Amino acid sequence: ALRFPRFSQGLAQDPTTRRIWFGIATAHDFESHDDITEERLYQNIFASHFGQLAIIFLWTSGNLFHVAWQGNFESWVQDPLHVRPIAHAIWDPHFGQPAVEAFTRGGALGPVNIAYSGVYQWWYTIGLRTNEDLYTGALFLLFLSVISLLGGWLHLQPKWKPSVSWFKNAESRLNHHLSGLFGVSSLAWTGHLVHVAIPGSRGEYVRWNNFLDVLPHPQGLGPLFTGQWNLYAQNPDSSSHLFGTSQGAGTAILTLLGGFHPQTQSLWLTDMAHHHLAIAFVFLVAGHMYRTNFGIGHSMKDLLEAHIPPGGRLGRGHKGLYDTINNSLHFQLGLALASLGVITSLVAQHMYSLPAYAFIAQDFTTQAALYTHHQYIAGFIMTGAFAHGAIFFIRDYNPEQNEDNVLARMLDHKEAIISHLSWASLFLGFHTLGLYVHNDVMLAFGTPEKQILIEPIFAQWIQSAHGKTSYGFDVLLSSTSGPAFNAGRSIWLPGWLNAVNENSNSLFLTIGPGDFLVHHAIALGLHTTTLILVKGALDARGSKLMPDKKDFGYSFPCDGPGRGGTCDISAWDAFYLAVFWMLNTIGWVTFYWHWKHITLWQGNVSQFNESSTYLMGWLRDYLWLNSSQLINGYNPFGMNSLSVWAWMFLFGHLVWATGFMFLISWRGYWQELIETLAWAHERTPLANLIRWRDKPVALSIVQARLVGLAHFSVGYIFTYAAFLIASTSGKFG
Amino acid sequence: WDHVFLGLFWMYNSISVVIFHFSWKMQSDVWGSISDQGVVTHITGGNFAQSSITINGWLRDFLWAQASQVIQSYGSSLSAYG
Amino acid sequence: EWMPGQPRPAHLDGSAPGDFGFDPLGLGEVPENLERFKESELIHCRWAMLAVPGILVPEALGLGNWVKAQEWAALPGGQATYLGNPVPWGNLPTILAIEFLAIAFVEHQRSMEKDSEKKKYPGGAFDPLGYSKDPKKFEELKLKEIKNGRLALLAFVGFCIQQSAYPGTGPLENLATHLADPWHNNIGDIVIP
Amino acid sequence: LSPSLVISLSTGLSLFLGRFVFFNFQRENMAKQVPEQNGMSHFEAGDTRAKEYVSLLKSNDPVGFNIVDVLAWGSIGHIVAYYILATASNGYDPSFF
Amino acid sequence: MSHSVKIYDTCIGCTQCVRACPTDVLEMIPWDGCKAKQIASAPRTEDCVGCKRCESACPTDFLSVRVYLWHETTRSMGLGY
Amino acid sequence: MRDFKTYLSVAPVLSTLWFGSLAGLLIEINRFFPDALTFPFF
Amino acid sequence: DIAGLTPCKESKQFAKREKQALKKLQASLKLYADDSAPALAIKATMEKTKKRFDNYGKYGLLCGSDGLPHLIVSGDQRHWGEFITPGILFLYIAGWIGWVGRSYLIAIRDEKKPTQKEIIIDVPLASSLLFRGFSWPVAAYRELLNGELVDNN
Numbered sequence A: 001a002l003r004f005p006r007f008s009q010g011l012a013q014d015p016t017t018r019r020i021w022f023g024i025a026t027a028h029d030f031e032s033h034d035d036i037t038e039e040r041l042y043q044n045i046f047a048s049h050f051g052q053l054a055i056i057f058l059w060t061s062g063n064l065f066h067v068a069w070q071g072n073f074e075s076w077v078q079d080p081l082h083v084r085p086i087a088h089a090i091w092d093p094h095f096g097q098p099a100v101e102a103f104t105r106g107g108a109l110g111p112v113n114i115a116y117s118g119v120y121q122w123w124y125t126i127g128l129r130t131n132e133d134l135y136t137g138a139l140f141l142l143f144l145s146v147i148s149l150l151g152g153w154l155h156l157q158p159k160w161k162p163s164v165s166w167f168k169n170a171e172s173r174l175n176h177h178l179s180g181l182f183g184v185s186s187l188a189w190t191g192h193l194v195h196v197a198i199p200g201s202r203g204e205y206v207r208w209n210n211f212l213d214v215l216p217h218p219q220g221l222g223p224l225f226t227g228q229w230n231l232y233a234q235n236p237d238s239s240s241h242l243f244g245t246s247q248g249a250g251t252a253i254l255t256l257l258g259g260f261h262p263q264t265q266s267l268w269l270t271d272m273a274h275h276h277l278a279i280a281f282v283f284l285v286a287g288h289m290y291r292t293n294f295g296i297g298h299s300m301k302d303l304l305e306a307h308i309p310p311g312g313r314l315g316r317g318h319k320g321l322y323d324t325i326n327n328s329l330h331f332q333l334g335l336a337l338a339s340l341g342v343i344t345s346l347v348a349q350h351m352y353s354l355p356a357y358a359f360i361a362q363d364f365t366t367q368a369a370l371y372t373h374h375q376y377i378a379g380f381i382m383t384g385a386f387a388h389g390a391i392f393f394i395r396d397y398n399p400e401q402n403e404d405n406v407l408a409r410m411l412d413h414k415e416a417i418i419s420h421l422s423w424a425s426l427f428l429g430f431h432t433l434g435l436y437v438h439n440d441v442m443l444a445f446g447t448p449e450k451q452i453l454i455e456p457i458f459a460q461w462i463q464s465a466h467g468k469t470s471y472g473f474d475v476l477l478s479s480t481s482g483p484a485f486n487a488g489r490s491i492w493l494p495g496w497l498n499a500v501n502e503n504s505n506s507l508f509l510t511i512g513p514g515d516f517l518v519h520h521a522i523a524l525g526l527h528t529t530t531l532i533l534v535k536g537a538l539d540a541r542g543s544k545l546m547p548d549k550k551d552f553g554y555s556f557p558c559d560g561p562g563r564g565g566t567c568d569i570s571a572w573d574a575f576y577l578a579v580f581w582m583l584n585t586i587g588w589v590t591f592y593w594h595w596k597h598i599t600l601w602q603g604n605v606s607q608f609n610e611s612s613t614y615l616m617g618w619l620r621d622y623l624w625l626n627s628s629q630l631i632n633g634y635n636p637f638g639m640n641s642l643s644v645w646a647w648m649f650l651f652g653h654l655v656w657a658t659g660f661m662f663l664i665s666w667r668g669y670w671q672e673l674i675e676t677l678a679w680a681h682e683r684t685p686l687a688n689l690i691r692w693r694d695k696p697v698a699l700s701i702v703q704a705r706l707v708g709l710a711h712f713s714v715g716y717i718f719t720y721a722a723f724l725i726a727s728t729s730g731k732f733g
Numbered sequence B: 001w002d003h004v005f006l007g008l009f010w011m012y013n014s015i016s017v018v019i020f021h022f023s024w025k026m027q028s029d030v031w032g033s034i035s036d037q038g039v040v041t042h043i044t045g046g047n048f049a050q051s052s053i054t055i056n057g058w059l060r061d062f063l064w065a066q067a068s069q070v071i072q073s074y075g076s077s078l079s080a081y082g
Numbered sequence C: 001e002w003m004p005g006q007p008r009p010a011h012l013d014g015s016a017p018g019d020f021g022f023d024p025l026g027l028g029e030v031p032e033n034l035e036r037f038k039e040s041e042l043i044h045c046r047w048a049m050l051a052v053p054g055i056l057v058p059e060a061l062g063l064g065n066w067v068k069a070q071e072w073a074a075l076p077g078g079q080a081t082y083l084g085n086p087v088p089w090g091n092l093p094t095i096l097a098i099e100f101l102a103i104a105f106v107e108h109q110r111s112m113e114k115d116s117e118k119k120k121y122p123g124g125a126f127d128p129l130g131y132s133k134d135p136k137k138f139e140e141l142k143l144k145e146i147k148n149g150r151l152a153l154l155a156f157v158g159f160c161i162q163q164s165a166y167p168g169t170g171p172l173e174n175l176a177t178h179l180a181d182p183w184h185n186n187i188g189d190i191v192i193p
Numbered sequence D: 001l002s003p004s005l006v007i008s009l010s011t012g013l014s015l016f017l018g019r020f021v022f023f024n025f026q027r028e029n030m031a032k033q034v035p036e037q038n039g040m041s042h043f044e045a046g047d048t049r050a051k052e053y054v055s056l057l058k059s060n061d062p063v064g065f066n067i068v069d070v071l072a073w074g075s076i077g078h079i080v081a082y083y084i085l086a087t088a089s090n091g092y093d094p095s096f097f
Numbered sequence E: 001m002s003h004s005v006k007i008y009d010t011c012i013g014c015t016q017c018v019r020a021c022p023t024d025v026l027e028m029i030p031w032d033g034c035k036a037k038q039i040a041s042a043p044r045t046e047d048c049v050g051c052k053r054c055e056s057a058c059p060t061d062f063l064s065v066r067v068y069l070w071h072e073t074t075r076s077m078g079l080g081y
Numbered sequence F: 001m002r003d004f005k006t007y008l009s010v011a012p013v014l015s016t017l018w019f020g021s022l023a024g025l026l027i028e029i030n031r032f033f034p035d036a037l038t039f040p041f042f
Numbered sequence G: 001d002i003a004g005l006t007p008c009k010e011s012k013q014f015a016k017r018e019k020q021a022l023k024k025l026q027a028s029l030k031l032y033a034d035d036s037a038p039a040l041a042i043k044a045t046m047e048k049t050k051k052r053f054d055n056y057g058k059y060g061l062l063c064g065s066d067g068l069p070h071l072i073v074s075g076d077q078r079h080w081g082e083f084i085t086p087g088i089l090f091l092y093i094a095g096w097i098g099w100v101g102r103s104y105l106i107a108i109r110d111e112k113k114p115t116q117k118e119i120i121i122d123v124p125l126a127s128s129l130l131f132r133g134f135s136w137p138v139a140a141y142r143e144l145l146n147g148e149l150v151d152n153n
């Protein structure tokens, strides 16, 4: 094209300002560009992936460098408690003198920010001890970023441009990624733990200098090649072991003993080494499954063809599904995002209950920030998975090649799926809201004993099945005579039971009726968001109101006011509506997590157990009570270090409320206002000299929906982050 | 009609700000109690002059501070208000 | 017919040995599927026929039962016993290795044959007494084999269920318990505790 | 145990099973399973690096046992042998019952 | 560089699509596939704004006139300035 | 009278009568059997 | 003692909650003469509270550590009256309502203007069909068996 954007001829000749907008949100959607082919699209995807890797490495290098240059890692290593981590220094010319006073924390000589990302504990656990290690790591990550950028440039040149069939070689890619990207990387991390991190935890400094001279075991690799692997699990670290020193240390490398370290309240490093070694073995085995140039292996196409149930209860089964899943990039993107979101929720739910880094369980603000961050990330990623599934249905789905498949039969019975999801969401919402309102009314009338409190008997039984003994159930892993208890009695059961039955950590917290109600509200949110996203995906190709939606693309505003009105009829609008429900669900999850943990850390779990059963308790004892120090960050009497969190709190409230006008007020009013504004500028003396090149127009309907959603999400995230960090930092527990 | 629908929100906003101003100003500078000696003690102690100039002051000293009488009304005769 | 007064399924016509028209779920609609089911059923019944004396006789001779004979592999360094005598090479790795080596290559030649009748009834070296020479007696023996094998499968279900109900004891002990006073100790006590 | 004896025995048994017992079934399954994209094989679709090495898979064995099968069945044997050795060394694990 | 207005053969012959057009995009041409012996046509889609009044008056089961929004000009964005 | 009975058969009037009768029944039940959390008759 | 819950009739915290409620009610009662209507209302409220606490204790409810009764919905036969019996009663009543509505919709389905029978309910037919939901489980089971419950479109 002759004008920005150059990838779209239709947008380039636009005389209005929306072109400037629309060249931004369509820049990375290569499939909608002008004069594109398949191989060019694949090569652009490859180059953008290399770029993204480069920015990830550069961001990590910047984190390491700023911690090394402005942080207090060396003084934090000596005293992991009673020392606050420092992320980076603060240089603000707008700062007043009391701002410089209140923000001078740690051993720093100026204003600093207190790191709540947990990178200090992670780097301390894995062997980094001094600032020169952080400088070397930052240099290595910068070199990796440069290498990835060079590779992205190289693989776009005509000599090194890959063919489209190379990208479609799914068997070799999956084999290499399972064996090399998963197995070999986990084996290398096992080697790092065994050679460096585990000796570092015992007071031995192992670097590239003494790399080849320090034996990880007294017996070397002999117990690895001649059998008798148990010689690597002879004497583990004692219960009186102190992290980072040789007092109470052992010489074991790979052990299977459950529970946490007594001092750090985190998992044993030898446990992690054995875990990553076993995972490396499993992935290296699994990476020899599919066929390659060597004749042996599986063909996933025939794997999908063969799995047809006789009787036709699944139609033609998975016939032809390999071609659709291999040819469609949006199918792969949706599956990748769904799996990534599921394991991100797994990461969030497993780091708080089974902490992985030394002295991170005591850092409550770090744990809260990490959990909230990864849960919001997982929610956004799952929403994107469903959105890209809808995109695949609109763009890449081929009905002729998918007849009587397990994929077409979803569209065959989409009404049943949508209606049953609607029933589940309606039932959950009706009964959960009714129970909550019942409890609020009963306690308002001075009768808290008339509440409906349902004990989560199922989840309590599951906790007893995992070894908890606070409910009286004599079941597996809690009864001393069970075969499950007897089989694993000698290996890991004592430590695991000691960690579970300890009522100070987050491992299998005691739950009550409030947990039941909030978990059912969580189920309501999940079911409703799934309902919206599944309805959008399955009605993306068309419905009775708009049978030809597939001809109108993924994102279009409406179909006019005819047929009763057709606002928000596209699948993009279904995604936009479901983002609100995802935000509400993650808000409920993080509210529950933060309140339960902030009552446990104070040793006042009775407040949560008695106040979480009604919504006024949530409003008063959680939102109103814990925001005193947050809103008192600055007052007429002065300010303190929580003033930044108060300012970000109000900033989030403001930008959350600003999206309400991109969401409520619509386009015609603003266009008719802009017409009068243009008339005023064209008729104002000394101002007709200055004229616009692009004609001012109102924001597009889809554009305004996106802008309002962005303001809404920014307000949600910033407000809750400010409240969470201020509440957990004004009192640490 | 949509212009009326939009202006309803702005009338709501304007009247809400007006009534918040009235409530805080009369609670801080007019309403209160008279002692037998002759001194006057107001409900909010005359904090409108120094706190209402900031949005944080409205959030803390007006919304958060005075909502304690409506969130703690459970179990009493004012629980219908909660 | 298995269930009098009930119509026969269309897949079964009564020509097969033991074809009593019992297929409520309609598993054998496809003819080659039905042939595979016939072969698999015959193998299951023959294994249970070898099982039932192999469970009853060691219990009757006072060597334990069919659950005691597997206790030694649970113990560390356990020693297997035959007729009260310990086999010198009877350790779990050696026993499992010889079982995998010899149970394979005897289940492999069985899959080499493609004739369905030979897959079910191979003959040859497996019929040394010439009982399959006369066709009428051949079908009669087919029906007898089918009926005794279904009885053996039911007996093995009884074995497993009685072991689950009464852990760590023998089926003949359960029979003696029933014969002690049949009106008081039976399935009723476990069906209503 | 003796690592050499166990490793040699397990590798020999696995190679024997691959050569004699489970050879025809495996050959038939690789005959039926060939990776194809868009109805054609990976190499003929335009991928120059997906060509099957017919020189490496050509063998003078009467049944066609080639080096790749040797590597796979030896991997099975070594894995089984090391499992046996590591389990026999440990005098624990589901033993209390 | 205009909205794409398409006429399909399911058109009855009612001129309501033409009468509902505020920019004179559609017209009625002779035909033989219906009783009315006429069908709609869109020769002036360069002046189409996209208001979709034409397909808000089409009485068929689904619309015989379809307006697909496309590249937008000064006369397609309804700009008097 | 037929028109008035038709008006009494319309949706809001009939709904009001039905829901008023139901609310009265529930209120009288709650007066005579107050503070019911379980079903203790069996 | 399911899930570590003491029975409400043997719970100290339950009696403590009753004591706080009675103390607050007596503090409210002290403002009025005993022969007045507000005093009689307060005394009736106190008697109702005492009866409620006694009934909750005698019903077999399990009280938690906070002194409030906790319902058990796992299906335990000691607590079938908390969820299962009221659940069966609710399912019966809801099936009654749904069956009556479905019968009314089916009856007015084949008319000239069926919608006129929805905005204006035909009361005699509705009252005729009201008691047909008394035997709703039998009718629904038979209709499912005869393939009349579902429509194959």
Ligand code: CLA
Pocket (backbone or CB within 6 Å): A045, A046, A049, A050, A051, A053, A166, A167, A169, A172, A173, A176, A177, A179, A180, A181, A182, A185
């Ligand atoms: C064995 C060699 C090998 C290796 C190492 C890789 C590696 C890679 N390839 Mg693959 N690839 C291979 C063979 C290989 N490939 C072959 C033979 C082909 C052709 C058939 C391809 C075709 C191919 C394509 C077409 C593309 C890739 C892509 C990628 C990159 C993925 C992005 C990423 O970094 O993942 C990072 C992920 C991990 C290291 C592991 C997974 C993470 C799990 C899910 C999380 C759990 C881990 C753990 C908890 C982490 C803790 C975090 C810490 C902070 C505590 C990665 C560099 C992309 C690319 O190159 O981008 C530049 C891409 O577009 N590959």
Ligand code: CLA
Pocket (backbone or CB within 6 Å): A422, A423, A425, A426, A427, A428, A429, A430, A433, A524, A528, A531, A532, A577, A578, A580, A581
């Ligand atoms: C916080 C307020 C709120 C509430 C309560 C709801 C409620 C609901 N949403 Mg909505 N929604 C909201 C905000 C809200 N939404 C926002 C901000 C958005 C973003 C635009 C959406 C977008 C949205 C989508 C995209 C979808 C829903 C759907 C639903 C339903 C979910 C299932 C369920 O929970 O039903 C339980 C029902 C209730 C909680 C509401 C009724 C409240 C009580 C029970 C009323 C009983 C009446 C009472 C006697 C009063 C009498 C009235 C009068 C006489 C005075 C439900 C009707 C989903 C759906 O339709 O599911 C079927 C769905 O598809 N919502």
Ligand code: CLA
Pocket (backbone or CB within 6 Å): A419, A420, A422, A423, A426, G097, G098, G099, G100, G101, G102, G104, G121, G126, G129
């Ligand atoms: C006549 C009775 C009636 C019956 C039998 C059904 C039946 C059904 N409904 Mg429908 N529905 C009705 C009325 C009815 N509905 C009404 C009035 C509305 C408007 C609020 C809806 C809206 C609706 C929704 C939004 C959903 C269903 C769903 C369902 C299914 C699951 C059950 C459930 O979710 O209930 C939930 C019921 C309602 C939300 C409450 C309204 C029902 C009232 C209490 C009764 C109506 C009775 C009528 C006015 C009485 C007249 C009597 C006559 C003598 C004149 C089920 C097939 C779900 C689904 O499709 O999944 C399969 C679901 O998602 N229904």
Ligand SMILES: CC1=C[C@H](O)CC(C)(C)[C@H]1/C=C/C(C)=C/C=C/C(C)=C/C=C/C=C(C)/C=C/C=C(C)/C=C/C1=C(C)C[C@H](O)CC1(C)C
Pocket (backbone or CB within 6 Å): C048, C049, C050, C052, C053, C125, C126, C127, C128, C129, C130, C131, C148, C149, C151, C152, C154, C155, C156, C158, C159, C162, C171, C172, C174, C175
């Ligand atoms: C083929 C051939 C060929 C060539 O040519 C020739 C010859 C060699 C001759 C041939 C062979 C043959 C043979 C080997 C046979 C065998 C058989 C058997 C063993 C059977 C079983 C069979 C078996 C059977 C029936 C079984 C049955 C069972 C039962 C009743 C049981 C019972 C019981 C009792 C009492 C008690 C307990 O508590 C319970 C129970 C346990 C329940």
Ligand SMILES: CC1=C(/C=C/C(C)=C/C=C/C(C)=C/C=C/C=C(C)/C=C/C=C(C)/C=C/C2=C(C)CCCC2(C)C)C(C)(C)CCC1
Pocket (backbone or CB within 6 Å): A330, A331, A332, A334, A335, A338, A339, A342, A382, A385, A386, A388, A389, A390, A392, A393, A537
């Ligand atoms: C739209 C669409 C799409 C997408 C979709 C999605 C997004 C989905 C998601 C999904 C998901 C998101 C899913 C999930 C799932 C899950 C699961 C499936 C789970 C499982 C689990 C398990 C199985 C477990 C088990 C166990 C337990 C219980 C415990 C113990 C242990 C064990 C392991 C045993 C696509 C593209 C495809 C296509 C087109 C359409």
Ligand SMILES: CC1=C(/C=C/C(C)=C/C=C/C(C)=C/C=C/C=C(C)/C=C/C=C(C)/C=C/C2=C(C)CCCC2(C)C)C(C)(C)CCC1
Pocket (backbone or CB within 6 Å): D011, D070, D071, D072, D073, D074, D075, D076, D078, D079, D082
């Ligand atoms: C010539 C011939 C012959 C001979 C042959 C032979 C003698 C062979 C051998 C062969 C072999 C002798 C093979 C081997 C293989 C192996 C492999 C291929 C590998 C495996 C392994 C793996 C893969 C891994 C391992 C590991 C490690 C690294 C450590 C840790 C653990 C594990 C185990 C994982 C005869 C005379 C017969 C005849 C004529 C011809």
Ligand code: SF4
Pocket (backbone or CB within 6 Å): E007, E010, E011, E012, E013, E014, E015, E016, E017, E018, E039, E040, E057, E058, E059, E060, E064, E065
């Ligand atoms: S396009 Fe619409 S209005 Fe015009 S003739 Fe066809 S149906 Fe009638």
Ligand code: SF4
Pocket (backbone or CB within 6 Å): E005, E020, E021, E022, E023, E024, E025, E026, E047, E048, E049, E050, E051, E052, E053, E054, E055, E067
């Ligand atoms: S969208 Fe409007 S301007 Fe365009 S053809 Fe239809 S009626 Fe005419």
